[PDB]
Amino acid sequence: GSSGSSGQYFVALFDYQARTAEDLSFRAGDKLQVLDTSHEGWWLARHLEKKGTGLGQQLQGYIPSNYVAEDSGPSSG
DSSP states (O other), X not given: OOSSSOOEEEEESSOXXXXXXSBOOBOTTOXXXXXXXXXXXXXXXXXXXXXXXXXXXXXXXXEETTTEEEOOOOOOO
16 A cells, blocks of 8 residues: 555675574565564564575565665655
């Protein structure tokens, strides 16, 4: 949506390898949607890009905001 249904999309500026399961991994240019922002640093986002290669273990998790940014996106469809 635009007003009602939330929608915060972020882009990964650089790569990041998650050490633990809780933490989510990604690469530079990975479309990630921020779900939870109850922490000035680690946000709960999910994988948007089509299924990866192989057997995906996790799709969402705690990811560093600094690593990503606000990538312009079409709110209305």
